[PDB]
User: Fold this.
Amino acid sequence: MLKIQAYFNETADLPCQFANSQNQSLSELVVFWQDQENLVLNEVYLGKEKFDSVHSKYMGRTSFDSDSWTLRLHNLQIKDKGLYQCIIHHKKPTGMIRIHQMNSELSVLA
Amino acid sequence: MLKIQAYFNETADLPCQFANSQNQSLSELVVFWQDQENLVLNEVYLGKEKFDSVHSKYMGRTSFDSDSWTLRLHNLQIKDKGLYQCIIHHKKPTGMIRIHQMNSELSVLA
Amino acid sequence: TICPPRQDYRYWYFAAELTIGVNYDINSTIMGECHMSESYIDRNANIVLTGYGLEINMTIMDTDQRFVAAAEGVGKDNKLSVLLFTTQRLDKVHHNISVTITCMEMNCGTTKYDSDLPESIHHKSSCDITINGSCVTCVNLETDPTKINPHYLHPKDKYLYRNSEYGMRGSYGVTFMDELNQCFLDIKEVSYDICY
Amino acid sequence: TICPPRQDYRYWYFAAELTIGVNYDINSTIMGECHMSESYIDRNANIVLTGYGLEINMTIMDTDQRFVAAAEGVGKDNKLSVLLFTTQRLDKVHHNISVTITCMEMNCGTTKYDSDLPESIHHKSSCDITINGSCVTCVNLETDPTKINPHYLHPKDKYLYRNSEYGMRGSYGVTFMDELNQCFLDIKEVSYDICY
Ligand SMILES: *[C@@H]1O[C@H](CO)[C@@H](O)[C@H](O)[C@H]1NC(C)=O
Ligand SMILES: *[C@@H]1O[C@H](CO)[C@@H](O)[C@H](O)[C@H]1NC(C)=O
Ligand SMILES: *[C@@H]1O[C@H](CO)[C@@H](O)[C@H](O)[C@H]1NC(C)=O
Ligand SMILES: *[C@@H]1O[C@H](CO)[C@@H](O)[C@H](O)[C@H]1NC(C)=O
Assistant:
């Protein structure tokens, strides 16, 4: 329900609008942003960024913001149009339960 | 039961003799006149003439009269001989019920 | 003239037709879908035939006729045409009719229509229609038809008759969508498998 | 709209899917392994289907739907995908769901998980998951899917519908291993033999 359009080779922002009804902290939650091929983009494991699986193409090009919960991606391409997802997990002692998911779509001038 | 004969390329009149036992108004009733191929000729939706489906050949050629409930058709042709029907519908909130139908036939000199 | 025979199976047929326009999806005839039950015992003719997704329950009051057989087919744009073959006509009195269409698949529900159709084509007979469900967009009933009722004129042994006097045909109709008059035409890919 | 028909076998289908990621070994579909039992009597829909090594017991509260059928297949990396076909949708209310996965071969045990999944994708419905045993590594449940649910679109006679409104889909998930999101993808060597 959130479509983003960007001018040619412009910068892109992917938010996923977590309500946070319980007022939890980033240290008890993990966040994944993934593309339509399921390859990961970025990860905040217990609050510290991890880059153990980001594909080289996405390495470094992405940045995170704490208060805004938004992923800032640079260097757009015509072939980078597609869908992206913000899968949020709550890391309880027993397991991880998915407590948020928000689909977004981005396209480029052609 | 009503056959109409007209001289070569003469004008034609199609009535359908609605008894109107309940003494209703044209605003609560709709009327269609159709040919033997099921293509519509004219339509009085809630009393206002509508021309959203009349085939171009019949556009403008037909005229309506209120008191007489008769359709006046101009520009007869040898190939326009056939059957015609006067379907009257009563547009209640629930739906439309057909409360009159009259078949007529017209032929031209040959 | 007074009596009908009350036989097992009739070699002599007649006609009366109707068509139901439903919104859920029907592709083609299934060759064995229909199943009908007929009765006359009460002095009133009756036939309940269950088919593609709805059961049609038709009854004629003061009839002197009994439904010999029926046929059912599906055409274009989700229409369902049922022909009904009655024994033989002894008199011209323009009977009343009662038809209930109950949706048994994909739109079940309680009653949504309980009015009567005036039929002022001659203004002598009235039909009462009751629809259970929401699987109806058009209903047309032609009594004493003059069209070519016979499907594959004619079955191997039976003989079939059809009215040819305009003064006896009647048309009852009710539509909920917009201007669907002449809800369907007979001679098409209609297969018309016998209703049993 | 009020009622469902309560028929024998349904020509009209729908969809809702889920996938269980188990650690013991499964190679390929066996063509006749699954066996399912359905019920509606209590006002709540229910389906218990026993398959490759676990029985899945799913229940929908205040449903107006009944599970017509199901299908089950096995993919790559020991995943088990079960599609569930329900009759038809009468309303949009976002029912709750209760699913219990009981391991019946190679890792039996007593209860190891009894929490509830919030599903804040819209944050209207909650699913309660109970797992007996240790033969689970991922659980995903997609309600009102928009993907291509139909396996071999479509079985010989049945008709199948699938939701196309994003506002109604829901996703419930729980994982014990590390970052197994999107636990499996549909169109693969998945055979999808009918579940009966
Ligand atoms: C058919 O309708 C009549 C009245 O219209 C009713 O008495 C009868 O029970 C109906 N038949 C069935 C099988 O429901
Ligand atoms: C009987 O003859 C009539 C006309 O010759 C024909 O319409 C009908 O099909 C025949 N029936 C049989 C059983 O031969
Ligand atoms: C399925 O689960 C329900 C409650 O979740 C339970 O009452 C029922 O007995 C279970 N069915 C079986 C076959 O165990
Ligand atoms: C019915 O037709 C639809 C579309 O034409 C098709 O998707 C479906 O498979 C058909 N079903 C049968 C039994 O022919």
User: Anything to note?
Assistant: Chain A has one domain: 1-110. The domain at 1-110 of chain A is CATH 2.60.40.10 (Immunoglobulin-like). Chains A and C do not touch (no CB pair under 8 Å). Strands of chain A lie at 2-5, 12-15, 29-35, 40-45, 48-50, 62-64, 70-73, 82-91, 96-100, 103-107.
